[PDB]
Structures are given as C-alpha cells and as structure tokens.
Paper text:
Computational designs are seeded by the sequences and structures of defined de novo oligomeric barrel-forming peptides, and adjacent helices are connected by loop building.
Encouraged by the successful design of sc-apCC-6 and sc-CC-7, we extended the seeded design approaches to target α-helical barrel proteins with five, six and eight central helices. Together, these additional designs delivered the de novo proteins sc-CC-5, sc-CC-6 and sc-CC-8. Thus, the cavities of five-helix-based barrels appear to be too narrow to accommodate dye. However, the symmetry of the central parallel helices is maintained. The backbone RMSD values for the repeating helix–turn–helix–turn–helix motifs are ≤0.5 Å, which is expected given the low sequence variation in the loops and the hydrophobic cores of these buttressing helices.
Residue numbers in the entry: 0 to 280
The structure:
Amino acid sequence: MEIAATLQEIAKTLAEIAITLAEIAKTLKPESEEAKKAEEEAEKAAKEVEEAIKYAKEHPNSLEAVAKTLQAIAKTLATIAKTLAYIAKTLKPESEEAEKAEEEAKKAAERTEKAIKYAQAHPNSLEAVAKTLLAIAWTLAVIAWTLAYIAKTLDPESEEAEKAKKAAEEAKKKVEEAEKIAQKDPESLEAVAKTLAAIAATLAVIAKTLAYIAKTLDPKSEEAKKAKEKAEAAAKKAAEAIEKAEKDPESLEAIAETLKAIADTLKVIAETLKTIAKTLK
C-alpha cells in the first residue's frame, strides 16, 4: 500500500508526543534543569523528524527515505524514554524501579545510537532497516515497562495496574522473539514484519495503560473516560494486523496494515497524552 507515507505520519505523531511529554515534565518540575533538557531534546527530535519528512517527500519510495525516517523515529523514541524515566523518578525519587527506568532508557539510547551507526554505513541494506526497527521496539518496551510502573504508583491496589505490568512483560517477550528472528535472517521481510508486529503489540499496551492513567488522574474528566474505548479500538486494530503479519510474514500487505495500526495507535496515544497534559495543569 503506502509504506513510506505511513512512516512519515508515524514520525510526525511521535514528534508531537515528544513535545507534549516535555511540557508535562515542565509542568511537574518548572524549575528543574532536567525538564529544560527534555524540552530542548524534544525540539531537536522534532527538527530531525521535519528534516526526514522533507527528505522522503523528495525521494519517494526509496530505501534511503525509509531508513532516514526510521532513524528520526528511533531518536524521537529515545528522548521520549529518557524524559518518561525522569518523570517516573519524580514520582518516587528513592524507588529502585525509578533508578532502573533511568538505566533502561540509557541503554535503549545506546542501542539506538549503535543501530543508527550501522544504518548510516549500510543505507542500501535491509539489515539496516531491521536493526533500526529493533532499536525502536526495544525502546518502546522500555517505555511500556516505565509507564506500567507509573500506573502502579498512582494506584497500587488496582488490578488494572498489575494488568499493565503483565501486558508490558508480554510485549517485551514479543520483542525478544522478534530479535531472535531478525538475528537469524536480517535480510528478509520476515524480520521486518515480526518486528513491526512486536512494535504494534507494545504500542497497544502503551495506549491502554495511558488511558488508565488519564482516568486515574482525573476520574471526572469525560475526555479521559473516552480514552479507554479509543485505546481498546486501536488495540483491536493492531491485533488484527498482527494476526496478518504472523500468518504471512513476507507479505507487503501485512507490513502495510501493521504500519497503519501503529500510526492509528500513536494518534490515540497523542490525544490521550494531551488530555493528561491538561489535567496536570
């Protein structure tokens, strides 16, 4: 269908997400240098997203356009994970899980830095695409784990908090299986489809966890209540695409449908995050 165009939409939504998350950090800690750095890095990521989108529009349907957009997506997710771990550290400064989130986000950024290095040395290679996609998947797994920790911190007595933790662990297992498949044959579409499937499953967990957080932060907000059904519909859409991707892992149609589900889930996440950003003000 429209692989390259859908990646441009994914990159744009992630840039908006990074900016909103930096606004939340500044709302929680107005005088902190970390929230200042979060805003500066989110702006830098948005600039690289803009540059990649303009480059791809001029080189339609090319491996280079795909690689450059995936690199912007990976860098944007790296700063999201770092800023989110800082937020988790703000809620419970002396908690060991907060220190673990910061360490996990740092390691995800190093993996992202190494994948981009390889991709820049092999811009005409599918191995570069699969490597960058795996860095994206691992960073999303860190985000999902950190977000489930935040959810548990707001209401440790809640069954939904443990459901988010278990869901994040299952998405991590999907990333681990994708990394195994890609390592065995990184120049096949199988590696791309299975890694995209893990990404879609992880974003589905994130969207449902984020909708729970919005509702917990503002039980009387009608916008926050609506995020549950919206995240569930996006999660069902991802589940459909994942089933196609594991049925025909070398299908271009399966790859396209999975990218569409990723883009749609990110739109729900971005909307939900905006509701949270207003709640905290």
